[PDB]
A paper describes a structure:
Immunoglobulin G ([name]) antibodies contain a complex N-glycan embedded in the hydrophobic pocket between its heavy chain protomers. This glycan contributes to the structural organization of the Fc domain and determines its specificity for Fcγ receptors, thereby dictating distinct cellular responses. Unlike other glycoproteins, [name] harbors two glycans which are buried in the cleft between the two heavy chains, and are thus not solvent exposed or readily accessible on the surface of the molecule to conventional probes. We previously described an approach to overcome this challenge and successfully identified synthetic nanobodies that can distinguish fucosylated and afucosylated [name] glycoforms. In the present study, we present the crystal structures of the afucosylated [name]-specific nanobody X0 in isolation, as well as in complex with afucosylated [name] Fc.
To define the molecular interactions between afucosylated [name] Fc-specific nanobodies and [name], we determined two crystal structures of X0 in complex with afucosylated [name] Fc. The P61 structure was determined by molecular replacement using the C2 structure as a search model. The final structures were refined to 2.6 Å for C2 and 2.7 Å for P61, and were nearly identical structurally, with an RMSD of 1.5 Å. The contact area between X0 and [name] Fc is unaffected. For all figures presented, the P61 structure was used. In both crystal structures, the X0-[name] Fc complex consists of two X0 nanobodies bound to one Fc homodimer, reflecting ability of X0 to recognize both open surfaces of the symmetrical Fc domain. However, consistent with an induced-fit model, the CDR3 loop undergoes a large conformational shift, curling downwards and wrapping around the [name] C’E loop to gain better access to the buried N-glycan at N297. G100 and T101 are positioned at the apex of the CDR3 loop in close proximity to the N-glycan. The main chain N atom of G100 forms a hydrogen bond with the O7 atom of the most proximal GlcNAc (+1). In addition, the Oγ1 atom of T101 forms a hydrogen bond with the O6 atom of the same GlcNAc residue. Accordingly, the absence of a core fucose provides a key recognition pocket for X0 which is obstructed in fucosylated [name] antibodies, suggesting that this is the mechanism governing X0 nanobody glycoform specificity.
Residue numbers in the entry:
A (entry chain D), B (entry chain C): 1 to 120
C (entry chain B), D (entry chain A): 237 to 443
The structure:
Amino acid sequence: QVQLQESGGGLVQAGGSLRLSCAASPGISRYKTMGWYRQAPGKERSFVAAITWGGLTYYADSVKGRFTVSRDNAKNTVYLQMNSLKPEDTAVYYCSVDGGTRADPYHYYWGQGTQVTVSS
Amino acid sequence: QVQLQESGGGLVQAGGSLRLSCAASPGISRYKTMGWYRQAPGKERSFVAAITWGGLTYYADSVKGRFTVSRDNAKNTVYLQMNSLKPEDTAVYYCSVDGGTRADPYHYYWGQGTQVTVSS
Amino acid sequence: GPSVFLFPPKPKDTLMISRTPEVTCVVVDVSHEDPEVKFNWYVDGVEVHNAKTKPREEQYNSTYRVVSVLTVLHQDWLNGKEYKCKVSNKALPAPIEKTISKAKGQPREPQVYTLPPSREEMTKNQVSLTCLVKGFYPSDIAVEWRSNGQPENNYKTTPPVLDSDGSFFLYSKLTVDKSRWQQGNVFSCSVMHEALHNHYTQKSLSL
Amino acid sequence: GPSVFLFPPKPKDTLMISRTPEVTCVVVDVSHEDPEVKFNWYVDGVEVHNAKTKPREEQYNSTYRVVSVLTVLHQDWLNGKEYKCKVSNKALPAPIEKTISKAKGQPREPQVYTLPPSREEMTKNQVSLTCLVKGFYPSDIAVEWRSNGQPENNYKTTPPVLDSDGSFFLYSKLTVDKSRWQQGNVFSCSVMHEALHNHYTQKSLSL
Ligand SMILES: *[C@@H]1O[C@H](CO)[C@@H](O[C@@H]2O[C@H](CO)[C@@H](O[C@@H]3O[C@H](CO[C@H]4O[C@H](CO)[C@@H](O)[C@H](O)[C@@H]4O[C@@H]4O[C@H](CO)[C@@H](O)[C@H](O)[C@H]4NC(C)=O)[C@@H](O)[C@H](O[C@H]4O[C@H](CO)[C@@H](O)[C@H](O)[C@@H]4O[C@@H]4O[C@H](CO)[C@@H](O)[C@H](O)[C@H]4NC(C)=O)[C@@H]3O)[C@H](O)[C@H]2NC(C)=O)[C@H](O)[C@H]1NC(C)=O
Ligand SMILES: *[C@@H]1O[C@H](CO)[C@@H](O[C@@H]2O[C@H](CO)[C@@H](O[C@@H]3O[C@H](CO[C@H]4O[C@H](CO)[C@@H](O)[C@H](O)[C@@H]4O[C@@H]4O[C@H](CO)[C@@H](O)[C@H](O)[C@H]4NC(C)=O)[C@@H](O)[C@H](O[C@H]4O[C@H](CO)[C@@H](O)[C@H](O)[C@@H]4O[C@@H]4O[C@H](CO)[C@@H](O)[C@H](O)[C@H]4NC(C)=O)[C@@H]3O)[C@H](O)[C@H]2NC(C)=O)[C@H](O)[C@H]1NC(C)=O
């Protein structure tokens, strides 16, 4: 079928660093854009980052400078290098395949989500 | 590699009747619409008739009632039966395969053109 | 592949009880090899089976278009419930999501002002009576002219325009015989909008 | 399948010697598999090699957008010359053609009227000065405000609207501090259109 599997969440500390990974079924990712979103309990989805097939990168203001997204086009995986993690980064993170235009994304596929938790 | 190839043009007398036909290579016509256009010397390529994959027929006002379009889906050929012709019909007639909407056609492939001449 | 567009109800339809507003889900570019589509409708996530779908729609380009219309009750729409269309098609690896709802943000009531024809229009055979309607949110609104209660048909209204503070304005133009305005007739600009309390407001204009 | 959209020059640019008008050809949905795009431009059938082309630009959705800009002679556009953009791309069996032109039909000169703020608006903090512009064809038009010579920027104008006689009309609303209006300043609604004498007209508005 068509799936997205995140990996790499877990427990981290304020000022620590985590690297998420996201693996896509063959094809569903080709020539398409991948984004990272996050979801804290009771609140909604934030854009986090995104990278296009050509490599252009987009970031939410909350993570600029701190997070960096990256992607190996031929290996069908996208990464989210989170550095210098802070107390509100705690949420479950999802990867996706995106269309539309940054103001209005269209989500083709969603990942299952991985918990990232930071203590103080 | 000839992809459209009309056949049947020539010289006719006013009030006569001619059949144009047009056969497409396999595939290029599959699930698509075929049209007939014409061009008089010094004039512009103008719509004549069209027949859809599903069978809807469209005619320019100049030819309503006088011409009738038809298409054999299994043979990838379209026919244009011209009846009661007069000198203003004299032009090079082209078959085509079309997209877009009757106001703004997109032509996938064009025929070679066949001269039809009506004398007085 | 097939493409989906989801349309809100017409503005008049949301504002009068005698009309029936509807949400419309359009699928274009559906192939001849796979012409069958399934519609699923969800009102705030819970499925409803009340929509009516019309037969396929062969286009000029030999593609099929399919439309399904879900009638909606006025109060749901004004109260902000979300409407969701789900389109499944064998030429589509996954179903498509479209969700539509009333515009978000605090509603604000229109202000109505009438402006008489410019004295320089008085040389013409007809004069223009203008209704400025400003300050309202969301953009759905009904504006008409009447005299003596019965309607007036030679009028035109502009689309809503975003003003610099995020609310909307528009203008309505009624043309009458310059005799009519000299005659001494009273004309009325009558407007309905969801933020009004007494179902309408009107302002009059006369020589 | 890539798509092409073809855009006219800005109305003011076609009416001033100091401005340079352009037609713009936009090609969307250009794949990474075939990013190569060729533009051919034809003015009433005659090819020109004068168009200036921008490098491709990937969008958020991982497809390319390529634009080609052709400068135009003012008189050519006003006189009805046809402009044609021809786009070829390997994902595409035959090139795409789009053609643009000034609208057909007898030009009609705009009438311009200025309408003071309504009486009932003078209780508000700012007031609205209205410029009604009607009876013109084609719909291309430019509207600005000036006071004492210099431009006035807190204005908004509606799109043109089709009237019942085939002409167009619009309104522009300039909002000024109502201290200034009762103070007695003079404001001007300035409009350019091809059917105006010397291409412009102005009407003033004061207490
Ligand atoms: C990936 O992401 C891409 C980038 O975001 C995205 O590109 C978008 O593609 C769509 C097509 O799918 C295209 O939509 C068209 O928009 C036309 C108007 O575009 C204006 O305005 C928008 C904002 O509203 C701007 O973003 C555009 O850049 C463009 O701006 C203009 O730019 C020029 C040149 O720079 C300036 O000079 C202008 O001043 C400036 N204007 C403004 C307001 O800023 C619109 O006309 C098109 O509609 C026509 O085709 C439709 C078919 O979809 C019909 O339904 C509709 O009625 C129109 O039909 C046309 O009607 C004409 C007269 O009415 C006829 O003469 C025509 O022949 C007829 N054409 C027909 C029938 O085919 C259309 O809506 C977006 O513009 C484009 N965005 C950008 C930024 O380029 C991709 O879609 C994304 N792909 C995927 C797969 O997701
Ligand atoms: C084969 O032939 C087909 C038949 O013509 C042709 O289908 C045409 O396909 C195009 C593109 O796929 C599609 O274009 C869309 O048009 C939307 C508006 O459609 C209106 O108005 C047009 C005329 O302007 C009518 O022709 C339509 O039928 C439709 O009529 C409305 O119908 C409803 C119910 O029937 C009535 O209630 C309405 O009153 C009536 N309106 C009328 C008559 O005026 C337009 O919204 C779409 O644009 C949006 O999506 C684009 C993505 O392509 C964006 O680029 C664009 O900027 C718009 O973005 C949207 O913006 C919204 C807010 O403004 C956001 O909320 C959305 O999220 C955002 N969506 C995005 C980004 O996806 C689009 O222009 C035509 O409508 C369709 N024609 C018909 C008749 O169905 C096929 O293309 C042909 N195929 C091939 C291969 O050639």
